[PDB]
Design a binder for this molecule. Sequence first.
Ligand SMILES: [Cl-]
Ligand SMILES: [Cl-]
Ligand SMILES: [Cl-]
Ligand SMILES: [Cl-]
Ligand SMILES: [Cl-]
Ligand SMILES: [Cl-]
Lengths: 171, 171, 171, 171, 171, 171
Amino acid sequence: SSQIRQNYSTEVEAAVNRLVNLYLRASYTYLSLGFYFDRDDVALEGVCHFFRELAEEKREGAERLLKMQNQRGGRALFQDLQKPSQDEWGTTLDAMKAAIVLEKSLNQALLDLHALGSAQADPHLCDFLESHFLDEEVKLIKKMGDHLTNIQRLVGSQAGLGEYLFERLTL
Amino acid sequence: SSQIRQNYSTEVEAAVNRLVNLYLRASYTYLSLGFYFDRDDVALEGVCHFFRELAEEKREGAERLLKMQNQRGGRALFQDLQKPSQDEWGTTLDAMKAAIVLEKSLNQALLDLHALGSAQADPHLCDFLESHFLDEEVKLIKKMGDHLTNIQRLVGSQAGLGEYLFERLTL
Amino acid sequence: SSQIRQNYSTEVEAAVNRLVNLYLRASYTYLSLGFYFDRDDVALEGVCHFFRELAEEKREGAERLLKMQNQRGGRALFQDLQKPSQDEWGTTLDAMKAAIVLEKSLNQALLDLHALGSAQADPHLCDFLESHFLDEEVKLIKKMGDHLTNIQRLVGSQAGLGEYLFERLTL
Amino acid sequence: SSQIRQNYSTEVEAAVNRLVNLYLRASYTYLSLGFYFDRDDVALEGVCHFFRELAEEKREGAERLLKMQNQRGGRALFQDLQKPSQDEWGTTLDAMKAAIVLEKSLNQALLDLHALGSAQADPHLCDFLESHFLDEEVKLIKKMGDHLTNIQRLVGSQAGLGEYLFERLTL
Amino acid sequence: SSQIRQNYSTEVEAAVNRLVNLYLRASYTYLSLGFYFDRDDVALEGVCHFFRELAEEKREGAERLLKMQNQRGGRALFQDLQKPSQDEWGTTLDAMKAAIVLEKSLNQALLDLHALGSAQADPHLCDFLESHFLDEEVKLIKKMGDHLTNIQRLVGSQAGLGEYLFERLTL
Amino acid sequence: SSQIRQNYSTEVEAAVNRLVNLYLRASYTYLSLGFYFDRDDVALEGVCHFFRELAEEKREGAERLLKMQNQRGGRALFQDLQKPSQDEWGTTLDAMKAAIVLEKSLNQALLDLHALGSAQADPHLCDFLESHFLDEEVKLIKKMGDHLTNIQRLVGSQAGLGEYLFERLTL
Ligand SMILES: [Cl-]
Ligand SMILES: [Cl-]
Ligand SMILES: [Cl-]
Ligand SMILES: [Cl-]
Ligand SMILES: [Cl-]
Ligand SMILES: [Cl-]
């Protein structure tokens, strides 16, 4: 039992460890998406770079949650990281749809945890999510929605052409 | 129905559009106050500049609310902008009293919307108001109260003299 | 009655206040067009930026007219600002057509006021419109006509593709 | 009754004045701890500097609370500052334990006030504590817990040696 | 009993601890005066800054006395800090009169302690007061007397006007 | 079947994907070791930093293997990442022993894969391991052996003292 722990519920502690698992899983998914778009038979470098950058952001999320865990006197506990849901990710469109689905699930986890922190009267947890995750997630989802719209407008008749142009002129 | 929208109530969406209307109305009021104090028969440049600067701040408020609207997947809807409540604004004192009344009504709108966001369990809205409006509004109201006190001390016997001196040495 | 006013007709004064209303209305229209193209389901950033920049130019127009009003000893009077004619603006093409219609109506207001100033023998008003509005308006209308032509050439068979390319390579 | 005060409960106002008293009392305690470790018969300069720096941080806390008090239109009221609980503070270990006890009581005061602000629907107070105190307090308590652990590992057989080494290589 | 203490009377040691209490009390008084003049209904920023700066100087005085205490091998002992004599400080005039009364009492404490050090044949104490307090106190009292005279000349018929002008053009 | 693949055996391809799994698992282990030594009740910052840096190096290893996979025309395939073998890592000594065990198993995987590449007559694979992994691994193992020796010499009678000193003066 901790020298520092104050106002830090076991329920929050545990949900924080699950969120770390989710973020790491997200990182892994993006590592898989990034290297799929680096395949010689896919070869969309801008799409590759976009997903690799998200791998990194999601790893950094987990790391910030682990630091906060320790700052509040909780105990990091790690679980198995499950492999991404797919081994091949189809088109840029398919991939960006899967990424928005993923982000909406991270975002709902963030909101679920905020609500718990709020029911537990844990304002530092609530602020920590407010300052470092909730707005970042909103901005990212807006950006992906923006991309989806542009990808979709570009499919038209000429899907290859549109995929090339999006990668070259937007990403 | 939106690709991005998550945890964003129609009630919040609508209140955000009304707040945009309020901020724009406030901007307009300050544009009118600014140009009244630029009249050759009023000629108080420091008072002019103070109100023009607030016109600009309130426009920027509306713009930030419109951006957030889009970031959450809501739909901006614009209404008629009603003209300022007055065509002539009297003394610096009169004007600063009207500006504090205006700001207290914007501030109560902000607090009403925070409360709604809080009842709707919308922590991103609550944080967004916290980070960009509530403290800014408090600081502005403090500053106007400070000015009012100084204007009032300067009326004394010699109202013209006091109005000149306030504009020259404070604004 | 004014210490400074000379050769400044009540007819000009009033038409100047109406032109201010028109410019502000134009600004508002462009604010609405700008945020429509920032929607996640429209997502054309170059179109957004083009219209936001015009919001700003039209606000600055009104501000210069209000300053001149005061410089000539007239009295600024503000009216209700009516909401933009549309809540959704369709394609880039639709939007640019609406913007040219708007600008042609501002331009005819400018010319109507010049003619009045000319009938009233008010050379300072005539010069002020000449120096700060008439050429600026011509240049803007030329630019919009240029854009319209390019948008139209790009519709061809492939409307999404053409809308993307115009926004990416021209705006 | 105030020209500026809005949504600022007498209950919050009073609790803010008590928190100011607590922070100042904390400052005083740290001033006493700092000068005890500057005694020629204690002579641990790094421990001295650590506590003097906290004296300063806690004074600055009180000052920020007094500023906010005025910004919200409340009235600062000062009380007697009670002397520190001890005139001599024993070992570095003893001192750091007393400092963690102190900080946990400041931290619980902060949380109590946040809860009150939350029950009173006072989001500006809640944000102000979130932005300037709650995380700072968590970080400080983590740091003191870190120090305690290191002090404790160093006692072992050789308490003087461990106290010297901690002061020389950590503080 | 001290390894370092030489020619340092218990009578001096104790009077030094009382002087520390006096200086801290003075600091507190000035902290209260500073925040009173930051009230929105008082709003005299130059008066605020003048008193806050004295809060700081008097804290630094106490700190230098505590350092010397330790340098001579005496033992710092802290007492209760009594609250300022007033919760509201009236006009700038009232406040500056109270500050001169306060400073004259600090100054008489300094002189009383010098006399004791002189009777005890403690030249280092006498020099320490000479080098760091007696002249500083004289200069401060001269400055406050200068301010009082200027405040008094400005009351005349027009007290608000004079209070504003003093704060704007002198402080 | 690949446009680029030449002299790249399915046996190598598969072993490369398993090595990626091993490196990622190693990264995870080091992430867990790093945050254990950041606990307030462990508090050895130099040990924390040493393991976090290895988390990063092992992630970069996996990333370089995934890039090479794609460069040779193989297909990255990801598996479940198993959780670290321990939730708590004991002393610095315990941790460094576990890290050397881990590295010896990575190193044997590297050598096993080199041998396979050598039996398959795949000189590019052999060179790639030579240039980017085998020497790096040797250097790291030497460094850990160096650390182990120093940790062990420092246990002596005084284990806490030795753990503190190693972290402060070596890491
Ligand atoms: Cl799975
Ligand atoms: Cl109206
Ligand atoms: Cl209308
Ligand atoms: Cl007491
Ligand atoms: Cl008292
Ligand atoms: Cl396992």
